[PDB]
Amino acid sequence: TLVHNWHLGRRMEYPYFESRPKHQFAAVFNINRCIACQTCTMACKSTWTFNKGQEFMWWNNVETKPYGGFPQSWDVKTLKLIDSPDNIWYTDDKDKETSQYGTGAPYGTYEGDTIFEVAKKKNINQWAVGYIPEDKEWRSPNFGEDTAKSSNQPGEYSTLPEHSRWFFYLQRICNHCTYPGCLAACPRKAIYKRKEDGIVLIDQKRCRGYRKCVEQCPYKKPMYRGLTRVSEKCIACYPRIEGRDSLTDGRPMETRCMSACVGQIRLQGFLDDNPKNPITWLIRHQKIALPLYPQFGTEPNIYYIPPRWAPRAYLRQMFGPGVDEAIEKFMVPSRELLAVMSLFRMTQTIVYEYKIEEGPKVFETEIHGKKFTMYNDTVIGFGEDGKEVVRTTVEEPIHIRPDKHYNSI
Amino acid sequence: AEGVKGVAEEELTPAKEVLNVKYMQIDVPAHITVGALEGAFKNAEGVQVKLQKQDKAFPNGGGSVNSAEIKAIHDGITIYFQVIWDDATDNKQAIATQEFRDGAALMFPLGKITISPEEPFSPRMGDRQKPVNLWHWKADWEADLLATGGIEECPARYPNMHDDFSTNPHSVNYHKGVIQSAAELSGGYAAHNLLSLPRGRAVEDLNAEGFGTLTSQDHQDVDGCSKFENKKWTVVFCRSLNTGDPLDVQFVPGESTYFNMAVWNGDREDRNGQKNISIQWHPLSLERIAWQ
Amino acid sequence: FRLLKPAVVVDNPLDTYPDRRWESVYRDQYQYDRTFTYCCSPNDTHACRIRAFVRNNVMMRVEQNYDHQNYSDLYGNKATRNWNPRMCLKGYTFHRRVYGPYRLRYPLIRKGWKRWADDGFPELTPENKTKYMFDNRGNDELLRASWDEAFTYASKGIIHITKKYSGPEGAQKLIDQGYPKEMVDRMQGAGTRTFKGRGGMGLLGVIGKYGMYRFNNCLAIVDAHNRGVGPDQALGGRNWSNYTWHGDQAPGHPFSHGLQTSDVDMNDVRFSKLLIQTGKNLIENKMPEAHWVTEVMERGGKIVVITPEYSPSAQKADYWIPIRNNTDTALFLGITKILIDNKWYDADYVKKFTDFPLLIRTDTLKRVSPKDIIPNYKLQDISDGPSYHIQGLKDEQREIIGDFVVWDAKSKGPKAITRDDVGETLVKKGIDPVLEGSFKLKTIDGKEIEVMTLLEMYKIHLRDYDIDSVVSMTNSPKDLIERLAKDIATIKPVAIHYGEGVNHYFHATLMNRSYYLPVMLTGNVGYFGSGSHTWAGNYKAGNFQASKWSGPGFYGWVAEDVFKPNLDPYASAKDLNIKGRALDEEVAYWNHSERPLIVNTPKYGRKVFTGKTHMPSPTKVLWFTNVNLINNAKHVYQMLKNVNPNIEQIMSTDIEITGSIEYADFAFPANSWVEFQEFEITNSCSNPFIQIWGKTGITPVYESKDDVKILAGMASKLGELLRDKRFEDNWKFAIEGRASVYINRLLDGSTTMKGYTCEDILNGKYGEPGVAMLLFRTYPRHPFWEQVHESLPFYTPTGRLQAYNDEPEIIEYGENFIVHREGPEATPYLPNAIVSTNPYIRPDDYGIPENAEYWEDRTVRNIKKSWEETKKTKNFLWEKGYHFYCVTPKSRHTVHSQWAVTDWNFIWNNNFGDPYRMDKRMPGVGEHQIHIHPQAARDLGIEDGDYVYVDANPADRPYEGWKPNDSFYKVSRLMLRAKYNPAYPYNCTMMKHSAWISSDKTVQAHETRPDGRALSPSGYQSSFRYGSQQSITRDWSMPMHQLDSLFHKAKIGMKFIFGFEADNHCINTVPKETLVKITKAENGGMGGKGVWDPVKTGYTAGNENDFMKKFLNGELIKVD
């Protein structure tokens, strides 16, 4: 069954016919702001994987690229199973138009084989290529922390556009893929994708610990629980999204790992066809946030703003060809992006639409070869019904107090 | 149809050698053990079943075991099947992510049928609107029966482990009560999945209407014991001839039905379709009771 | 009877699923009953406001409150939502510590001390010390005590020991033990001055923790009982310092501007447009506020990081400047030279507000004094000026501080100016100083003297800091130095941020002074987004700021008259009798083997470099709360082996068994932040918020009390044994369960908090039901804002930012100018050498040869030497193989000794974390690691993941007099795993600060337990197999930090002082002045066989295979 994947800009081989959700659970991670505090990591741990049998399980992990990973060297291990000289992107016939929800070819066309198509061509008699990480490969969740790549020449120093000595942080959960490898792997069809929000779940009543999801998931999110003799995965905290936490008063709430983000890098919502949704705007209209390893062919739905300082060659191989234009937009933010970026982690309630009330200009200069102007706009976020749920300003106010008070103390 | 081969005629025609269940008053203790039944099965005659890799559907696996001996005896009250195959490794637990269990299973068509290419009933775990009963023996369940809680837990696999809540000798009463409550344990334990609970049993009684459709029964009726010695497994299945569950195979002395077999080797990572299958239904006949 | 569905059929998992009733599994797990709010206050410096979720009265998880929008002050000013969410990973796992296996459960007393107390407190001869196990406290047993029993033994011991060393007979006992006469004379006959009471970083809770300073004050009564003296002649305990002891103060700040610390509310940093970071990891050590810096690259700002390593803060930098360690003074001197050669300075901003226009005399190197050139001169009457009415100057002080001379441009000739005549005050008068010029003058005596501008003197000073030599000193790219030099000159606001990456080296004082030079000239001090700032823990006890209109402030709680306490609940803070009788002391003297800086000079025999104001006293009793003092103490195994056995009573209040308890005599279980049964107040220096919390969490998990009651219970037993009621009077409202009285007495009486009520703040009157905002002049509190915008003087002798210091000790030390100096140990060249040829630097070498290897000799060797001559010198340690720096920065995974052992955080701080502990050699679910450059390890035959020994100067560390066969040497020598990180230079190694140190019992258990876990039978867990990160560290006694004539501002009051102030101009400890030797210890492979498993992959840094190199270069994917 050929299916359309807009990340690859191509039709793809999948066991099941294409059936997209009404809207897709998605999020944007601004890697440039990340600090690797692993606050999101402890958010998921203290909530879902804190008990017996899940001691090695870290559904949310932030890893130091390029050497780091959980499980150890997970990207390189899977990328080797699809290594071919034909894994190439072609950018010329990339859509100029912004295509409708679930369609199009924004980044171009990737003519390399996905994990499903590699399995098909070799006739390996499995739905996808993969491996089961051994229990020793699940050790060291912070493997390669703050380990940089170096040119190893004596006069080495780091400057823009690309740092000679460099490393960045990759924040990973279950991508809740449109065509997940784990769902196709399970022969019992015990993994299913919800049509309401696109959340992928393992049926704990029907799972039999077949480890095929663990085997064929290229992102290694499904993990086998020794105690229960069945596998578990990130549930996208679906009770919080279903509005079952009284803190958001029945409104859909961002997942627990997203709400925890300290360096205000992640915004969680849904991929609509609405261009006024800050999630849909960033991913399809600005193309500033890009999926993690679209080479695999699962259509991940966690999109990243690439680091401004990392080697562009490494970044394209990880996020596709859209990296160059995403960084150009970020380093000198447009007026509307800076206001939308100032919306990240201002509330825990999911915001479905944004709109801006304009304010006075505060600062302007020329930077990175072009002119940047900044205004103190007020960005506003709205809920599922159009009700306002959040509001903040781009620039901080200043208060002056009676002279009986002092600062120099 | 991508991941599955067409059903070949060799699969649809039943085998020719018949497995005869010999009638013999079986005197057994409470705790049934393979040794306790060895004297009985010695007087029965068994069929040598041929085993093959499962190549017919995705996933493909197996090939580690090629043959298995099967014998069967009955009381007029209880039926016992003994299955023997050679395997060099004792895989008795599946707690580590890379480890799998050795297993064996028998399957029976539910209800009374005659199978032929003209009246086909697929041996691939049944087929749609043609249900089947399954008896799945699990080696780890044998080890769970001997654990202090009816199930082996993680320290049995990782004896050096430490957890600040579960391995804390100073845990307050109400803290541990909430944290290790069924709701907070979650997963199979909260969802009452059998693979996560102390079943007090070694064989799972389950049904299927084809492969990819295997379903665990609500009322478990089959039990069994096992023995691994000198690179060989000996497993016997124990079930009453008749049970109150309509989804159970019903045996009648003097009646004949069919059966099929499969074996798993955890050393070669056998789970699901990676099973050492028999490709054909095998005939089964029950002797009449020697009424005094 | 209805037809059964025998099996469940699924068609397309993408489209539809037959049954989803199971999904309640996770919804049942996420369910909670109630929510509550507290404040996490572990010396984070953030004091986050926390919302925890409870299920059936069990604290299950936590989440941010998302409450900053609601924060407001008395005036109605409010905060923004841009402050959200702001929490750390350690905040999320605090409950794992609350219900954890390392928790303190009941009061503890050591067997060999209760034994000593039961035998009548006999004289502690060496025979008695070994018998009662004072020399070996790590192989004794900690026994359970009831609170009354624990209090009674402790109180009896306090009375005995304070009476033991009180008299003249006590003074001679201290001379017989080897203490200097200066330390015994400081006691002044008080035995209680041997009691050292430390409230550890009391701003975390002022009532519960700074109450220790109140306890110390109360001990004056015990002194009255011991010696039979009157209230005025009675002296109590000595308050142990916090800010300086940790090395957190920037020592140059009292010299440059005369204030304790220049820091900002970090929302202000996001106003900066070129932001410079020199000695600080803002990304890993101020994480909840780090978004204020990361977002500067998004609003037209430029970020600069100047570190030897490519740190997590370097990612965010526009350009990273590598530098050699302990050399930043030279870098900013070179940039200052570039700013002055090209006149890229705001002449107007430096004519005002700065000492550069002030003229300097050549005979004495002091600034010229109008008394010296004006006949019959009188000092101007500035009694109506802002130095008396705002800053609180006294006539006796003004007389010493004097007046200074400037050369007016309008009337050619010397002009006399005052401290208050700063900023726009000179334009209102006739003065228009000249920045340049060398003038001939004649004294009143007729003796001609040459006087020239500091800028002229700087112009001649900066000839040794040419762009090429500074690159030879700093190994920094010359293009980046000129790039930063230009950026500082073309951008406004410019801000320089630093921390203990540079403050933990000996010459930090010079470095911090160096950190104002480029910012004084460019006009970037006092304006939003600008300044030169240091970052540290939460030190600002001066938030309870005392003044005339306000009141006693912090003194109301800690310096209330013990013999005249106010027992009226409705007492205004101005109705309190303020008289403290606890003499502040710096902790580092204890860390210095209980000795001041005394060196037996060959030129002037035995000379003491410690000022009288800084003089310590012998430590015989010790008690500390909210600190892991011994575990986190520097040179720890020396402290345990040769220093602490002579401390007769060691006591610790804590919530966990920390290894400081393991080597202590008493342990008192306190309530954690979620089990507070009484209200508590805290503030921060990085945020303007006030958080008050208590009684709203869970009931105490074990037999714990609030710190306020532990202090009161200790005082009550002292009163019960001494038949004195005045003890309970000083803790009356604490005992009665009403600490809000003391909190109100602190709110009222503080410049930032008078008008606030504890009851009102706690109820949501200003927004959140636990938060308000303290009252500075500006919401983004920026230091010196009122000084530049309203033309007010700084807190220096000149009232101006100072690039020069004329105090006599400073000139004798050779540091009157901002000069670059090599470290006494952390340099490849001559230790403590002065790199300059300036004839105006005239230091005294003290006749100490350049061969001197003794640390106290190297401390005071002030030898001037040119840079070209210095490059040919040689550090003795560097040439014997100890040629690796060893930085001990702080980590994102710990707050010092907190969360360093919590399993979840303990798994992530290292490359080796494993909850199942498959490698039994691993100390716990984690082990501490050392970072080393791959080539460096390969040259010593060390592969990534191998165990390595970290050895330092044998003479000094791990402990003096060690021998390879001592049982304690096995405990002291550090053996940790090595980690390849090519982000570091060849000669630089890194260990994160504060894991739980190896003790006797952890080593015994690591070698006895089958699983190999380093877990003491007491429950204490070490993070190392052997040794600690404090095995290669030492205390350095700075002569520059022990001055008696440093006119700076008192931290707590709007007033001035001379000499030492605890946490304000005292010893600033330096753990990074060290070099280490690395040698392979054991193979990293499991069981000691082969190599550590990830190296076999070929996917490791320094061991990349051709495929990984294809990965690292992004060659796996091509576009067009």
Ligand SMILES: Nc1nc2c(c(=O)[nH]1)N[C@@H](/C(S)=C(/S)[C@H](O)COP(=O)(O)OP(=O)(O)OC[C@H]1O[C@@H](n3cnc4c(=O)[nH]c(N)nc43)[C@H](O)[C@@H]1O)C=N2
């Ligand atoms: N080689 C080297 N040496 C160095 C440094 C370095 O970088 N390298 N750095 C310095 C510096 S800057 C610092 S800030 C110190 O490590 C911090 O000192 P501290 O002992 O207070 O940390 P800590 O986190 O342990 O203080 C908290 C302790 O109190 C416990 N606690 C936590 N909450 C409470 C409470 O509510 N009440 C009470 N009574 N105790 C509580 C806590 O468990 C810990 O023991 C110092 N030396």
Ligand SMILES: Nc1nc2c(c(=O)[nH]1)N[C@@H](/C(S)=C(/S)[C@H](O)COP(=O)(O)OP(=O)(O)OC[C@H]1O[C@@H](n3cnc4c(=O)[nH]c(N)nc43)[C@H](O)[C@@H]1O)C=N2
């Ligand atoms: N989450 C969390 N937050 C916290 C703490 C925590 O433990 N956890 N600690 C507290 C406290 S009490 C403190 S004092 C601060 O975090 C200290 O952090 P800081 O970054 O300034 O020291 P650090 O030792 O890390 O040094 C910073 C960088 O300077 C490098 N360095 C070291 N030597 C030099 C040198 O000679 N020159 C230069 N230019 N840089 C040098 C150092 O490697 C580090 O990158 C409050 N914040």
Ligand code: HEM
């Ligand atoms: C060509 C023949 C067969 C194929 C392609 C096949 C395929 C599969 C598949 C896809 C599954 C997992 C999906 C599910 O559980 O519904 C499975 C599981 C299973 N089958 Fe079949 N099957 C075949 C024959 C058999 C036979 C002859 C038996 C013997 C009774 C059998 C017994 C079982 C058992 C016990 C399991 C569960 C395995 C476990 O829980 O670890 N199957 N098989």
Ligand code: SF4
């Ligand atoms: S990331 Fe892995 S587990 Fe998550 S949906 Fe995709 S394939 Fe499934």
Ligand code: SF4
């Ligand atoms: S989305 Fe929810 S379940 Fe998944 S990692 Fe984040 S917090 Fe955990």
Ligand code: SF4
């Ligand atoms: S909380 Fe946010 S900034 Fe911190 S590690 Fe996670 S994603 Fe990165």
Ligand code: SF4
């Ligand atoms: S640990 Fe520090 S940053 Fe984290 S919540 Fe507590 S106070 Fe805030």
Ligand code: F3S
């Ligand atoms: S393959 Fe299926 S049976 Fe469970 S372990 Fe994975 S969801």
Ligand SMILES: [Ca+2]
């Ligand atoms: Ca086997």
Ligand SMILES: [Ca+2]
């Ligand atoms: Ca049944």
Ligand SMILES: [Mo]
């Ligand atoms: Mo600190």
